[PDB]
Amino acid sequence: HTLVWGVWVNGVDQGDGRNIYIRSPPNNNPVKNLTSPDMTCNVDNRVVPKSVPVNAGDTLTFEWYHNTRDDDIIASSHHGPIAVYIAPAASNGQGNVWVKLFEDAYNVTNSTWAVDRLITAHGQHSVVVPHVAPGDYLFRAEIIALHEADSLYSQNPIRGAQFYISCAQITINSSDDSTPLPAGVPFPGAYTDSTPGIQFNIYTTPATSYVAPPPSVWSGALGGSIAQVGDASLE
Numbered sequence: 001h002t003l004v005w006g007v008w009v010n011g012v013d014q015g016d017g018r019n020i021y022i023r024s025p026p027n028n029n030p031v032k033n034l035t036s037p038d039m040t041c042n043v044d045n046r047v048v049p050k051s052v053p054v055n056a057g058d059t060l061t062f063e064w065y066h067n068t069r070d071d072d073i074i075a076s077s078h079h080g081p082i083a084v085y086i087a088p089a090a091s092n093g094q095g096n097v098w099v100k101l102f103e104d105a106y107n108v109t110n111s112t113w114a115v116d117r118l119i120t121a122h123g124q125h126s127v128v129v130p131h132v133a134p135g136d137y138l139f140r141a142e143i144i145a146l147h148e149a150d151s152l153y154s155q156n157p158i159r160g161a162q163f164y165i166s167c168a169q170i171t172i173n174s175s176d177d178s179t180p181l182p183a184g185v186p187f188p189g190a191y192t193d194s195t196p197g198i199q200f201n202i203y204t205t206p207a208t209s210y211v212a213p214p215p216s217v218w219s220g221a222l223g224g225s226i227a228q229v230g231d232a233s234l235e
């Protein structure tokens, strides 16, 4: 149970974004139904009044929280991967539009899931803004909690993979468009009951065997991190 509070651009806090530049849902409950319209941008997908200006190559950091800013972030039970996708804003997230910029699942070097590292990072994970066409975009940050993912939601609706999905409105101003955005995958649609990484038993299956759901990270993606970029307590 987690939500995005706001974003930072090159380590500069853009301020509380909830219902302002984040398409915030009414609460921190997960989406679990893979065919739900809620898979696009969570349960309250609508245009919010602000879009955060960035340039290609900027570091864009998403900041998550549980109940209040810079708290426990997410229950430590909620092990799983983190992904970030981008789509042009005119799509409203509909159709074959979502391109994956970032994936982090289980780190064999560190023996830690991405969610474990997100807690250590006070809720902060980042991407490099790609060199796509200037204009308005949606950045869809997705945490998958796998603590009840041994079942499919479609077999037992009390269980299943939990999707914490947050869509930020970002305007890319300066960009040479050296990597034009291609067509992508649809949400809902990309993840099905047979997709690798959706049904996974963390109690019985070693995390070293986990394969995150496709699609693969786009060849235009410039990377990212799970790391604290800004100190919310200094405000």
Ligand SMILES: [Cu+2]
Binding pocket: 001, 002, 075, 078
């Ligand atoms: Cu939860």
